[PDB]
Amino acid sequence: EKPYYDVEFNYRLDPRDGGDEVIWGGTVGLMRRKYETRTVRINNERGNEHNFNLDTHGFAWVKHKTSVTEFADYLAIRQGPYYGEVAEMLKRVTGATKVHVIGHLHRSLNYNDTTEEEKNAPDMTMTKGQTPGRFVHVDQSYQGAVRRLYLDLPQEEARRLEKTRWAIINVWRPVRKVTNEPLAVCDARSVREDELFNTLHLVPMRWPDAAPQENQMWAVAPPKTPTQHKWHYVSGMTEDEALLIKMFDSKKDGTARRVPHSSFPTPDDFGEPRASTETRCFVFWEDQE
Ligand SMILES: O=C(O)CNC(=O)C(=O)O
Ligand SMILES: [Cu+2]
């Protein structure tokens, strides 16, 4: 709960320098993926949250309370009220006409310990549980956003809702007060279009009976400067708080469209491993053409 942190971030390593362009989600090998590392400054915004919104910067920290407390049972979450409570809040915060909550991802493993525990495991093995997303990314590219819409909605509702303004937003809530590996978000205005690279993202569920689940992300080019990209986080985020992260917005002028984000360690990290859920939401404004 210092004013800032200077931490090494993981950015896109160009293929010319040895990089690859497949993000193997949930696998051991992704933890060994190579990156272009750069030191960036992340400003603590605890107390300054009112100066950040999804329209300008693409992200927002909100006070939102929920009755749900246990998050590691995927089935119990999907069949409980959590998705509906996220919907009501997001609809209220965004003024959306309709909110579709598609799913969530639970993270609870410590990054370093998992690297150690899995150092002899084959690349394509899938960890039991999920570690922090410790690299700069946007969960959906522009192409990936369209791909998700038609994968997560019926074909005709996806075609109807594509005719009005729609957006993808992750709602990130910790299981408890964050005392290690917080979540950094990057001002959408401070990253140019030509720094974004459509990067394919695969999860080999049910292999070999099924092709790995397909997704397309933004990878982000490294900055020349610690402050070229404008990074922010909020220290001590509690389970009563939600970090909204706009991955995509169909509206090209007048609103932020994509937020690079990444978990990061601080030297003041302590306590049992950070646990969180990020719930993926489609947001629609059927008023807006
Ligand atoms: O929590 C983490 O470590 C990473 N989370 C995300 O990237 C997200 O919510 O989209
Ligand atoms: Cu993410």
Side-chain angles (χ1 to χ4, degrees), residues 105 107 131-134 137 139 170-172 181-183 245 247 261-263 274 276-280:
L105 169 73
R107 313 179 181 256
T131 59
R134 215 183 244 194
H137 69 286
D139 287 42
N170 281 14
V171 177
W172 190 98
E181 195 100 24
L183 189 62
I245 311 188
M247 309 301 176
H261 53 289
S262 161
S263 66
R274 193 251 291 152
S276 69
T277 68
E278 54 218 44
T279 168
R280 291 104 163 207

mmCIF file with all atom_site columns, all heavy atoms in Angstrom, residues 105 107 131-134 137 139 170-172 181-183 245 247 261-263 274 276-280, ligand 1:
data_model
loop_
_atom_site.group_PDB
_atom_site.id
_atom_site.type_symbol
_atom_site.label_atom_id
_atom_site.label_alt_id
_atom_site.label_comp_id
_atom_site.label_asym_id
_atom_site.label_entity_id
_atom_site.label_seq_id
_atom_site.pdbx_PDB_ins_code
_atom_site.Cartn_x
_atom_site.Cartn_y
_atom_site.Cartn_z
_atom_site.occupancy
_atom_site.B_iso_or_equiv
_atom_site.pdbx_formal_charge
_atom_site.auth_seq_id
_atom_site.auth_comp_id
_atom_site.auth_asym_id
_atom_site.auth_atom_id
_atom_site.pdbx_PDB_model_num
ATOM   1   N N   . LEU A 1 105 ? -13.291 -18.089 -14.368 1.00 0.00 ? 105 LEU A N   1
ATOM   2   C CA  . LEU A 1 105 ? -12.073 -18.857 -14.157 1.00 0.00 ? 105 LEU A CA  1
ATOM   3   C C   . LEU A 1 105 ? -11.571 -18.598 -12.747 1.00 0.00 ? 105 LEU A C   1
ATOM   4   O O   . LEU A 1 105 ? -11.468 -17.442 -12.323 1.00 0.00 ? 105 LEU A O   1
ATOM   5   C CB  . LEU A 1 105 ? -10.991 -18.493 -15.177 1.00 0.00 ? 105 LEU A CB  1
ATOM   6   C CG  . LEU A 1 105 ? -9.597  -19.047 -14.874 1.00 0.00 ? 105 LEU A CG  1
ATOM   7   C CD1 . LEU A 1 105 ? -9.547  -20.544 -15.145 1.00 0.00 ? 105 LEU A CD1 1
ATOM   8   C CD2 . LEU A 1 105 ? -8.537  -18.321 -15.682 1.00 0.00 ? 105 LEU A CD2 1
ATOM   9   N N   . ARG A 1 107 ? -8.586  -18.860 -9.974  1.00 0.00 ? 107 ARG A N   1
ATOM   10  C CA  . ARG A 1 107 ? -7.146  -18.941 -9.781  1.00 0.00 ? 107 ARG A CA  1
ATOM   11  C C   . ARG A 1 107 ? -6.842  -18.960 -8.290  1.00 0.00 ? 107 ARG A C   1
ATOM   12  O O   . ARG A 1 107 ? -7.448  -18.212 -7.519  1.00 0.00 ? 107 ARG A O   1
ATOM   13  C CB  . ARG A 1 107 ? -6.429  -17.763 -10.447 1.00 0.00 ? 107 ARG A CB  1
ATOM   14  C CG  . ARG A 1 107 ? -6.880  -17.475 -11.868 1.00 0.00 ? 107 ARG A CG  1
ATOM   15  C CD  . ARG A 1 107 ? -6.142  -16.276 -12.428 1.00 0.00 ? 107 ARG A CD  1
ATOM   16  N NE  . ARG A 1 107 ? -6.558  -15.949 -13.787 1.00 0.00 ? 107 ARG A NE  1
ATOM   17  C CZ  . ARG A 1 107 ? -5.841  -16.224 -14.873 1.00 0.00 ? 107 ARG A CZ  1
ATOM   18  N NH1 . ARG A 1 107 ? -4.669  -16.835 -14.759 1.00 0.00 ? 107 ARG A NH1 1
ATOM   19  N NH2 . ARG A 1 107 ? -6.298  -15.887 -16.072 1.00 0.00 ? 107 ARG A NH2 1
ATOM   20  N N   . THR A 1 131 ? -2.746  -20.801 -11.964 1.00 0.00 ? 131 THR A N   1
ATOM   21  C CA  . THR A 1 131 ? -1.885  -19.752 -11.388 1.00 0.00 ? 131 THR A CA  1
ATOM   22  C C   . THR A 1 131 ? -2.241  -18.375 -11.947 1.00 0.00 ? 131 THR A C   1
ATOM   23  O O   . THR A 1 131 ? -3.077  -18.276 -12.799 1.00 0.00 ? 131 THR A O   1
ATOM   24  C CB  . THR A 1 131 ? -0.402  -20.015 -11.638 1.00 0.00 ? 131 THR A CB  1
ATOM   25  O OG1 . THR A 1 131 ? -0.288  -20.064 -13.045 1.00 0.00 ? 131 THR A OG1 1
ATOM   26  C CG2 . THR A 1 131 ? 0.122   -21.284 -11.013 1.00 0.00 ? 131 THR A CG2 1
ATOM   27  N N   . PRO A 1 132 ? -1.643  -17.327 -11.411 1.00 0.00 ? 132 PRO A N   1
ATOM   28  C CA  . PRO A 1 132 ? -1.869  -15.985 -11.904 1.00 0.00 ? 132 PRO A CA  1
ATOM   29  C C   . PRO A 1 132 ? -1.469  -15.791 -13.371 1.00 0.00 ? 132 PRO A C   1
ATOM   30  O O   . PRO A 1 132 ? -0.564  -16.368 -13.810 1.00 0.00 ? 132 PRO A O   1
ATOM   31  C CB  . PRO A 1 132 ? -0.874  -15.183 -11.076 1.00 0.00 ? 132 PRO A CB  1
ATOM   32  C CG  . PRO A 1 132 ? -1.002  -15.757 -9.747  1.00 0.00 ? 132 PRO A CG  1
ATOM   33  C CD  . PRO A 1 132 ? -1.272  -17.212 -10.019 1.00 0.00 ? 132 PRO A CD  1
ATOM   34  N N   . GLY A 1 133 ? -2.230  -14.964 -14.067 1.00 0.00 ? 133 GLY A N   1
ATOM   35  C CA  . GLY A 1 133 ? -1.950  -14.574 -15.449 1.00 0.00 ? 133 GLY A CA  1
ATOM   36  C C   . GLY A 1 133 ? -0.844  -13.561 -15.432 1.00 0.00 ? 133 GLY A C   1
ATOM   37  O O   . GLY A 1 133 ? -1.118  -12.399 -15.472 1.00 0.00 ? 133 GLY A O   1
ATOM   38  N N   . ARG A 1 134 ? 0.374   -14.056 -15.356 1.00 0.00 ? 134 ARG A N   1
ATOM   39  C CA  . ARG A 1 134 ? 1.554   -13.210 -15.183 1.00 0.00 ? 134 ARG A CA  1
ATOM   40  C C   . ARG A 1 134 ? 2.173   -12.796 -16.515 1.00 0.00 ? 134 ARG A C   1
ATOM   41  O O   . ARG A 1 134 ? 3.368   -12.981 -16.746 1.00 0.00 ? 134 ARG A O   1
ATOM   42  C CB  . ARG A 1 134 ? 2.574   -13.935 -14.313 1.00 0.00 ? 134 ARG A CB  1
ATOM   43  C CG  . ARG A 1 134 ? 3.364   -13.031 -13.386 1.00 0.00 ? 134 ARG A CG  1
ATOM   44  C CD  . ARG A 1 134 ? 4.405   -13.824 -12.616 1.00 0.00 ? 134 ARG A CD  1
ATOM   45  N NE  . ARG A 1 134 ? 4.145   -13.824 -11.179 1.00 0.00 ? 134 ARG A NE  1
ATOM   46  C CZ  . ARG A 1 134 ? 5.030   -14.202 -10.263 1.00 0.00 ? 134 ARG A CZ  1
ATOM   47  N NH1 . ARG A 1 134 ? 6.236   -14.613 -10.632 1.00 0.00 ? 134 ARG A NH1 1
ATOM   48  N NH2 . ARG A 1 134 ? 4.708   -14.171 -8.978  1.00 0.00 ? 134 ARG A NH2 1
ATOM   49  N N   . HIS A 1 137 ? -1.697  -9.045  -21.549 1.00 0.00 ? 137 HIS A N   1
ATOM   50  C CA  . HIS A 1 137 ? -2.612  -9.632  -22.516 1.00 0.00 ? 137 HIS A CA  1
ATOM   51  C C   . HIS A 1 137 ? -3.946  -8.905  -22.452 1.00 0.00 ? 137 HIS A C   1
ATOM   52  O O   . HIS A 1 137 ? -4.251  -8.202  -21.484 1.00 0.00 ? 137 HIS A O   1
ATOM   53  C CB  . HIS A 1 137 ? -2.824  -11.128 -22.251 1.00 0.00 ? 137 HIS A CB  1
ATOM   54  C CG  . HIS A 1 137 ? -3.581  -11.413 -20.991 1.00 0.00 ? 137 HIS A CG  1
ATOM   55  N ND1 . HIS A 1 137 ? -3.021  -11.273 -19.740 1.00 0.00 ? 137 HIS A ND1 1
ATOM   56  C CD2 . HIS A 1 137 ? -4.858  -11.819 -20.788 1.00 0.00 ? 137 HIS A CD2 1
ATOM   57  C CE1 . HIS A 1 137 ? -3.917  -11.584 -18.819 1.00 0.00 ? 137 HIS A CE1 1
ATOM   58  N NE2 . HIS A 1 137 ? -5.041  -11.919 -19.430 1.00 0.00 ? 137 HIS A NE2 1
ATOM   59  N N   . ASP A 1 139 ? -7.854  -10.453 -23.056 1.00 0.00 ? 139 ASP A N   1
ATOM   60  C CA  . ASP A 1 139 ? -8.446  -11.781 -23.178 1.00 0.00 ? 139 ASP A CA  1
ATOM   61  C C   . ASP A 1 139 ? -9.091  -12.024 -24.536 1.00 0.00 ? 139 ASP A C   1
ATOM   62  O O   . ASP A 1 139 ? -9.214  -13.182 -24.950 1.00 0.00 ? 139 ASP A O   1
ATOM   63  C CB  . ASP A 1 139 ? -9.469  -11.989 -22.060 1.00 0.00 ? 139 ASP A CB  1
ATOM   64  C CG  . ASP A 1 139 ? -8.817  -12.205 -20.712 1.00 0.00 ? 139 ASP A CG  1
ATOM   65  O OD1 . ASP A 1 139 ? -7.839  -11.485 -20.407 1.00 0.00 ? 139 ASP A OD1 1
ATOM   66  O OD2 . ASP A 1 139 ? -9.271  -13.092 -19.960 1.00 0.00 ? 139 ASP A OD2 1
ATOM   67  N N   . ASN A 1 170 ? -14.484 -8.567  -18.127 1.00 0.00 ? 170 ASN A N   1
ATOM   68  C CA  . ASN A 1 170 ? -14.240 -9.503  -17.039 1.00 0.00 ? 170 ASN A CA  1
ATOM   69  C C   . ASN A 1 170 ? -14.446 -8.800  -15.705 1.00 0.00 ? 170 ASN A C   1
ATOM   70  O O   . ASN A 1 170 ? -13.996 -7.668  -15.510 1.00 0.00 ? 170 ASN A O   1
ATOM   71  C CB  . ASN A 1 170 ? -12.823 -10.072 -17.108 1.00 0.00 ? 170 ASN A CB  1
ATOM   72  C CG  . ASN A 1 170 ? -12.683 -11.175 -18.135 1.00 0.00 ? 170 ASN A CG  1
ATOM   73  O OD1 . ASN A 1 170 ? -13.555 -11.361 -18.983 1.00 0.00 ? 170 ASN A OD1 1
ATOM   74  N ND2 . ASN A 1 170 ? -11.581 -11.915 -18.064 1.00 0.00 ? 170 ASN A ND2 1
ATOM   75  N N   . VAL A 1 171 ? -15.129 -9.477  -14.789 1.00 0.00 ? 171 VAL A N   1
ATOM   76  C CA  . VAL A 1 171 ? -15.341 -8.979  -13.435 1.00 0.00 ? 171 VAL A CA  1
ATOM   77  C C   . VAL A 1 171 ? -14.449 -9.800  -12.513 1.00 0.00 ? 171 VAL A C   1
ATOM   78  O O   . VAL A 1 171 ? -14.677 -10.998 -12.309 1.00 0.00 ? 171 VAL A O   1
ATOM   79  C CB  . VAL A 1 171 ? -16.815 -9.063  -13.017 1.00 0.00 ? 171 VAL A CB  1
ATOM   80  C CG1 . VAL A 1 171 ? -16.987 -8.595  -11.583 1.00 0.00 ? 171 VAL A CG1 1
ATOM   81  C CG2 . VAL A 1 171 ? -17.684 -8.245  -13.964 1.00 0.00 ? 171 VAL A CG2 1
ATOM   82  N N   . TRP A 1 172 ? -13.433 -9.151  -11.954 1.00 0.00 ? 172 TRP A N   1
ATOM   83  C CA  . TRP A 1 172 ? -12.372 -9.809  -11.201 1.00 0.00 ? 172 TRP A CA  1
ATOM   84  C C   . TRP A 1 172 ? -12.546 -9.503  -9.719  1.00 0.00 ? 172 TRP A C   1
ATOM   85  O O   . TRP A 1 172 ? -12.464 -8.340  -9.308  1.00 0.00 ? 172 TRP A O   1
ATOM   86  C CB  . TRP A 1 172 ? -11.005 -9.339  -11.700 1.00 0.00 ? 172 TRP A CB  1
ATOM   87  C CG  . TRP A 1 172 ? -9.829  -10.098 -11.168 1.00 0.00 ? 172 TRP A CG  1
ATOM   88  C CD1 . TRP A 1 172 ? -9.158  -11.110 -11.793 1.00 0.00 ? 172 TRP A CD1 1
ATOM   89  C CD2 . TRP A 1 172 ? -9.158  -9.884  -9.919  1.00 0.00 ? 172 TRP A CD2 1
ATOM   90  N NE1 . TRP A 1 172 ? -8.121  -11.548 -11.005 1.00 0.00 ? 172 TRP A NE1 1
ATOM   91  C CE2 . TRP A 1 172 ? -8.101  -10.813 -9.849  1.00 0.00 ? 172 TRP A CE2 1
ATOM   92  C CE3 . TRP A 1 172 ? -9.356  -9.004  -8.849  1.00 0.00 ? 172 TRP A CE3 1
ATOM   93  C CZ2 . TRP A 1 172 ? -7.243  -10.887 -8.753  1.00 0.00 ? 172 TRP A CZ2 1
ATOM   94  C CZ3 . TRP A 1 172 ? -8.502  -9.080  -7.763  1.00 0.00 ? 172 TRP A CZ3 1
ATOM   95  C CH2 . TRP A 1 172 ? -7.460  -10.015 -7.722  1.00 0.00 ? 172 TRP A CH2 1
ATOM   96  N N   . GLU A 1 181 ? 0.454   -10.968 -5.256  1.00 0.00 ? 181 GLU A N   1
ATOM   97  C CA  . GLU A 1 181 ? 0.174   -11.043 -6.688  1.00 0.00 ? 181 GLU A CA  1
ATOM   98  C C   . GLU A 1 181 ? -1.093  -10.282 -7.071  1.00 0.00 ? 181 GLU A C   1
ATOM   99  O O   . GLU A 1 181 ? -2.084  -10.897 -7.489  1.00 0.00 ? 181 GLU A O   1
ATOM   100 C CB  . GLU A 1 181 ? 0.070   -12.505 -7.134  1.00 0.00 ? 181 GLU A CB  1
ATOM   101 C CG  . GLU A 1 181 ? 0.139   -12.703 -8.644  1.00 0.00 ? 181 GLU A CG  1
ATOM   102 C CD  . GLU A 1 181 ? 1.509   -13.135 -9.121  1.00 0.00 ? 181 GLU A CD  1
ATOM   103 O OE1 . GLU A 1 181 ? 2.264   -13.721 -8.317  1.00 0.00 ? 181 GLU A OE1 1
ATOM   104 O OE2 . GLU A 1 181 ? 1.830   -12.889 -10.304 1.00 0.00 ? 181 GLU A OE2 1
ATOM   105 N N   . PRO A 1 182 ? -1.109  -8.950  -6.953  1.00 0.00 ? 182 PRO A N   1
ATOM   106 C CA  . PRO A 1 182 ? -2.300  -8.194  -7.370  1.00 0.00 ? 182 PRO A CA  1
ATOM   107 C C   . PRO A 1 182 ? -2.451  -8.139  -8.883  1.00 0.00 ? 182 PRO A C   1
ATOM   108 O O   . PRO A 1 182 ? -1.641  -8.713  -9.617  1.00 0.00 ? 182 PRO A O   1
ATOM   109 C CB  . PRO A 1 182 ? -2.060  -6.804  -6.772  1.00 0.00 ? 182 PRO A CB  1
ATOM   110 C CG  . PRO A 1 182 ? -0.584  -6.697  -6.648  1.00 0.00 ? 182 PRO A CG  1
ATOM   111 C CD  . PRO A 1 182 ? -0.075  -8.078  -6.367  1.00 0.00 ? 182 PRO A CD  1
ATOM   112 N N   . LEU A 1 183 ? -3.483  -7.445  -9.362  1.00 0.00 ? 183 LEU A N   1
ATOM   113 C CA  . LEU A 1 183 ? -3.832  -7.424  -10.779 1.00 0.00 ? 183 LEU A CA  1
ATOM   114 C C   . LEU A 1 183 ? -3.663  -6.009  -11.318 1.00 0.00 ? 183 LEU A C   1
ATOM   115 O O   . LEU A 1 183 ? -4.375  -5.091  -10.897 1.00 0.00 ? 183 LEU A O   1
ATOM   116 C CB  . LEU A 1 183 ? -5.263  -7.912  -10.996 1.00 0.00 ? 183 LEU A CB  1
ATOM   117 C CG  . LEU A 1 183 ? -5.637  -8.136  -12.462 1.00 0.00 ? 183 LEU A CG  1
ATOM   118 C CD1 . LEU A 1 183 ? -4.750  -9.210  -13.070 1.00 0.00 ? 183 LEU A CD1 1
ATOM   119 C CD2 . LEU A 1 183 ? -7.100  -8.504  -12.596 1.00 0.00 ? 183 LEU A CD2 1
ATOM   120 N N   . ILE A 1 245 ? -12.889 -5.048  -16.179 1.00 0.00 ? 245 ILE A N   1
ATOM   121 C CA  . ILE A 1 245 ? -11.844 -4.919  -17.193 1.00 0.00 ? 245 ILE A CA  1
ATOM   122 C C   . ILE A 1 245 ? -12.483 -5.107  -18.562 1.00 0.00 ? 245 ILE A C   1
ATOM   123 O O   . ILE A 1 245 ? -12.894 -6.220  -18.913 1.00 0.00 ? 245 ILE A O   1
ATOM   124 C CB  . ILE A 1 245 ? -10.703 -5.927  -16.984 1.00 0.00 ? 245 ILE A CB  1
ATOM   125 C CG1 . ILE A 1 245 ? -10.219 -5.905  -15.529 1.00 0.00 ? 245 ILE A CG1 1
ATOM   126 C CG2 . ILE A 1 245 ? -9.554  -5.630  -17.936 1.00 0.00 ? 245 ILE A CG2 1
ATOM   127 C CD1 . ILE A 1 245 ? -8.979  -6.730  -15.290 1.00 0.00 ? 245 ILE A CD1 1
ATOM   128 N N   . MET A 1 247 ? -12.460 -5.921  -22.134 1.00 0.00 ? 247 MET A N   1
ATOM   129 C CA  . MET A 1 247 ? -11.617 -6.587  -23.119 1.00 0.00 ? 247 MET A CA  1
ATOM   130 C C   . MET A 1 247 ? -11.901 -6.106  -24.531 1.00 0.00 ? 247 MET A C   1
ATOM   131 O O   . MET A 1 247 ? -10.982 -6.034  -25.357 1.00 0.00 ? 247 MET A O   1
ATOM   132 C CB  . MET A 1 247 ? -11.817 -8.101  -23.056 1.00 0.00 ? 247 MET A CB  1
ATOM   133 C CG  . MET A 1 247 ? -11.686 -8.685  -21.670 1.00 0.00 ? 247 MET A CG  1
ATOM   134 S SD  . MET A 1 247 ? -10.064 -8.350  -20.974 1.00 0.00 ? 247 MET A SD  1
ATOM   135 C CE  . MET A 1 247 ? -10.266 -9.025  -19.334 1.00 0.00 ? 247 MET A CE  1
ATOM   136 N N   . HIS A 1 261 ? -3.711  -6.208  -19.390 1.00 0.00 ? 261 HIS A N   1
ATOM   137 C CA  . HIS A 1 261 ? -3.663  -6.433  -17.955 1.00 0.00 ? 261 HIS A CA  1
ATOM   138 C C   . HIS A 1 261 ? -2.752  -7.616  -17.672 1.00 0.00 ? 261 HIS A C   1
ATOM   139 O O   . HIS A 1 261 ? -2.474  -8.436  -18.552 1.00 0.00 ? 261 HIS A O   1
ATOM   140 C CB  . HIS A 1 261 ? -5.061  -6.672  -17.370 1.00 0.00 ? 261 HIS A CB  1
ATOM   141 C CG  . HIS A 1 261 ? -5.825  -7.758  -18.060 1.00 0.00 ? 261 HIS A CG  1
ATOM   142 N ND1 . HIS A 1 261 ? -6.329  -7.619  -19.335 1.00 0.00 ? 261 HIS A ND1 1
ATOM   143 C CD2 . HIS A 1 261 ? -6.174  -9.001  -17.652 1.00 0.00 ? 261 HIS A CD2 1
ATOM   144 C CE1 . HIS A 1 261 ? -6.949  -8.730  -19.685 1.00 0.00 ? 261 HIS A CE1 1
ATOM   145 N NE2 . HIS A 1 261 ? -6.874  -9.583  -18.680 1.00 0.00 ? 261 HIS A NE2 1
ATOM   146 N N   . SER A 1 262 ? -2.291  -7.692  -16.427 1.00 0.00 ? 262 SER A N   1
ATOM   147 C CA  . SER A 1 262 ? -1.393  -8.757  -16.008 1.00 0.00 ? 262 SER A CA  1
ATOM   148 C C   . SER A 1 262 ? -1.273  -8.737  -14.495 1.00 0.00 ? 262 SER A C   1
ATOM   149 O O   . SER A 1 262 ? -1.227  -7.666  -13.886 1.00 0.00 ? 262 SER A O   1
ATOM   150 C CB  . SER A 1 262 ? -0.004  -8.602  -16.643 1.00 0.00 ? 262 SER A CB  1
ATOM   151 O OG  . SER A 1 262 ? 0.964   -9.352  -15.933 1.00 0.00 ? 262 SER A OG  1
ATOM   152 N N   . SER A 1 263 ? -1.231  -9.922  -13.898 1.00 0.00 ? 263 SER A N   1
ATOM   153 C CA  . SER A 1 263 ? -0.852  -10.030 -12.501 1.00 0.00 ? 263 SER A CA  1
ATOM   154 C C   . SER A 1 263 ? 0.640   -9.762  -12.356 1.00 0.00 ? 263 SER A C   1
ATOM   155 O O   . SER A 1 263 ? 1.424   -9.975  -13.285 1.00 0.00 ? 263 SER A O   1
ATOM   156 C CB  . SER A 1 263 ? -1.193  -11.416 -11.956 1.00 0.00 ? 263 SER A CB  1
ATOM   157 O OG  . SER A 1 263 ? -0.400  -12.411 -12.579 1.00 0.00 ? 263 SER A OG  1
ATOM   158 N N   . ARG A 1 274 ? -2.848  -15.781 -3.397  1.00 0.00 ? 274 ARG A N   1
ATOM   159 C CA  . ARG A 1 274 ? -4.001  -15.028 -3.869  1.00 0.00 ? 274 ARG A CA  1
ATOM   160 C C   . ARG A 1 274 ? -4.992  -15.949 -4.568  1.00 0.00 ? 274 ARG A C   1
ATOM   161 O O   . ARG A 1 274 ? -4.611  -16.783 -5.392  1.00 0.00 ? 274 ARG A O   1
ATOM   162 C CB  . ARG A 1 274 ? -3.545  -13.920 -4.825  1.00 0.00 ? 274 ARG A CB  1
ATOM   163 C CG  . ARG A 1 274 ? -4.613  -12.884 -5.136  1.00 0.00 ? 274 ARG A CG  1
ATOM   164 C CD  . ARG A 1 274 ? -5.129  -13.013 -6.567  1.00 0.00 ? 274 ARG A CD  1
ATOM   165 N NE  . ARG A 1 274 ? -4.133  -12.635 -7.567  1.00 0.00 ? 274 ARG A NE  1
ATOM   166 C CZ  . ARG A 1 274 ? -4.098  -13.121 -8.804  1.00 0.00 ? 274 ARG A CZ  1
ATOM   167 N NH1 . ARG A 1 274 ? -5.007  -14.002 -9.194  1.00 0.00 ? 274 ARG A NH1 1
ATOM   168 N NH2 . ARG A 1 274 ? -3.158  -12.724 -9.653  1.00 0.00 ? 274 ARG A NH2 1
ATOM   169 N N   . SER A 1 276 ? -8.899  -15.875 -6.569  1.00 0.00 ? 276 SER A N   1
ATOM   170 C CA  . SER A 1 276 ? -9.796  -14.947 -7.244  1.00 0.00 ? 276 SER A CA  1
ATOM   171 C C   . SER A 1 276 ? -10.624 -15.697 -8.272  1.00 0.00 ? 276 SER A C   1
ATOM   172 O O   . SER A 1 276 ? -10.274 -16.801 -8.699  1.00 0.00 ? 276 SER A O   1
ATOM   173 C CB  . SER A 1 276 ? -9.019  -13.813 -7.922  1.00 0.00 ? 276 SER A CB  1
ATOM   174 O OG  . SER A 1 276 ? -8.278  -14.298 -9.029  1.00 0.00 ? 276 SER A OG  1
ATOM   175 N N   . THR A 1 277 ? -11.736 -15.079 -8.656  1.00 0.00 ? 277 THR A N   1
ATOM   176 C CA  . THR A 1 277 ? -12.504 -15.478 -9.825  1.00 0.00 ? 277 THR A CA  1
ATOM   177 C C   . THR A 1 277 ? -12.626 -14.288 -10.763 1.00 0.00 ? 277 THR A C   1
ATOM   178 O O   . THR A 1 277 ? -12.829 -13.153 -10.322 1.00 0.00 ? 277 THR A O   1
ATOM   179 C CB  . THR A 1 277 ? -13.903 -15.982 -9.459  1.00 0.00 ? 277 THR A CB  1
ATOM   180 O OG1 . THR A 1 277 ? -14.696 -14.895 -8.964  1.00 0.00 ? 277 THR A OG1 1
ATOM   181 C CG2 . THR A 1 277 ? -13.819 -17.072 -8.417  1.00 0.00 ? 277 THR A CG2 1
ATOM   182 N N   . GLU A 1 278 ? -12.482 -14.557 -12.056 1.00 0.00 ? 278 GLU A N   1
ATOM   183 C CA  . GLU A 1 278 ? -12.766 -13.591 -13.107 1.00 0.00 ? 278 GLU A CA  1
ATOM   184 C C   . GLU A 1 278 ? -13.916 -14.147 -13.932 1.00 0.00 ? 278 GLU A C   1
ATOM   185 O O   . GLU A 1 278 ? -13.795 -15.225 -14.520 1.00 0.00 ? 278 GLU A O   1
ATOM   186 C CB  . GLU A 1 278 ? -11.528 -13.333 -13.971 1.00 0.00 ? 278 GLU A CB  1
ATOM   187 C CG  . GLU A 1 278 ? -10.893 -14.590 -14.552 1.00 0.00 ? 278 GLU A CG  1
ATOM   188 C CD  . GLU A 1 278 ? -9.383  -14.541 -14.572 1.00 0.00 ? 278 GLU A CD  1
ATOM   189 O OE1 . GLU A 1 278 ? -8.782  -14.108 -13.567 1.00 0.00 ? 278 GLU A OE1 1
ATOM   190 O OE2 . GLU A 1 278 ? -8.791  -14.947 -15.595 1.00 0.00 ? 278 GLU A OE2 1
ATOM   191 N N   . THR A 1 279 ? -15.038 -13.437 -13.951 1.00 0.00 ? 279 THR A N   1
ATOM   192 C CA  . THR A 1 279 ? -16.235 -13.911 -14.632 1.00 0.00 ? 279 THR A CA  1
ATOM   193 C C   . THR A 1 279 ? -16.438 -13.126 -15.921 1.00 0.00 ? 279 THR A C   1
ATOM   194 O O   . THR A 1 279 ? -16.474 -11.890 -15.909 1.00 0.00 ? 279 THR A O   1
ATOM   195 C CB  . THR A 1 279 ? -17.468 -13.822 -13.727 1.00 0.00 ? 279 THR A CB  1
ATOM   196 O OG1 . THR A 1 279 ? -18.653 -14.025 -14.504 1.00 0.00 ? 279 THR A OG1 1
ATOM   197 C CG2 . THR A 1 279 ? -17.548 -12.484 -13.027 1.00 0.00 ? 279 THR A CG2 1
ATOM   198 N N   . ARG A 1 280 ? -16.562 -13.852 -17.031 1.00 0.00 ? 280 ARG A N   1
ATOM   199 C CA  . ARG A 1 280 ? -16.579 -13.259 -18.361 1.00 0.00 ? 280 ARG A CA  1
ATOM   200 C C   . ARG A 1 280 ? -18.001 -12.887 -18.754 1.00 0.00 ? 280 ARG A C   1
ATOM   201 O O   . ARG A 1 280 ? -18.905 -13.728 -18.713 1.00 0.00 ? 280 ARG A O   1
ATOM   202 C CB  . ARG A 1 280 ? -15.976 -14.230 -19.375 1.00 0.00 ? 280 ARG A CB  1
ATOM   203 C CG  . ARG A 1 280 ? -14.482 -14.423 -19.199 1.00 0.00 ? 280 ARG A CG  1
ATOM   204 C CD  . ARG A 1 280 ? -14.138 -15.745 -18.530 1.00 0.00 ? 280 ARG A CD  1
ATOM   205 N NE  . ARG A 1 280 ? -12.734 -16.088 -18.741 1.00 0.00 ? 280 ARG A NE  1
ATOM   206 C CZ  . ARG A 1 280 ? -12.261 -17.329 -18.758 1.00 0.00 ? 280 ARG A CZ  1
ATOM   207 N NH1 . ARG A 1 280 ? -13.081 -18.355 -18.573 1.00 0.00 ? 280 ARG A NH1 1
ATOM   208 N NH2 . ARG A 1 280 ? -10.968 -17.544 -18.961 1.00 0.00 ? 280 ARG A NH2 1
HETATM 209 O O1  . LIG B 2 .   ? -5.966  -12.977 -11.894 1.00 0.00 ? 1   LIG B O1  1
HETATM 210 C C1  . LIG B 2 .   ? -5.018  -13.113 -12.710 1.00 0.00 ? 1   LIG B C1  1
HETATM 211 O O2  . LIG B 2 .   ? -3.879  -13.457 -12.302 1.00 0.00 ? 1   LIG B O2  1
HETATM 212 C C2  . LIG B 2 .   ? -5.246  -12.866 -14.199 1.00 0.00 ? 1   LIG B C2  1
HETATM 213 N N1  . LIG B 2 .   ? -6.634  -12.512 -14.436 1.00 0.00 ? 1   LIG B N1  1
HETATM 214 C C3  . LIG B 2 .   ? -7.017  -12.019 -15.746 1.00 0.00 ? 1   LIG B C3  1
HETATM 215 O O3  . LIG B 2 .   ? -6.196  -11.911 -16.594 1.00 0.00 ? 1   LIG B O3  1
HETATM 216 C C4  . LIG B 2 .   ? -8.462  -11.633 -16.041 1.00 0.00 ? 1   LIG B C4  1
HETATM 217 O O4  . LIG B 2 .   ? -9.270  -11.448 -15.094 1.00 0.00 ? 1   LIG B O4  1
HETATM 218 O O5  . LIG B 2 .   ? -8.837  -11.501 -17.235 1.00 0.00 ? 1   LIG B O5  1
#
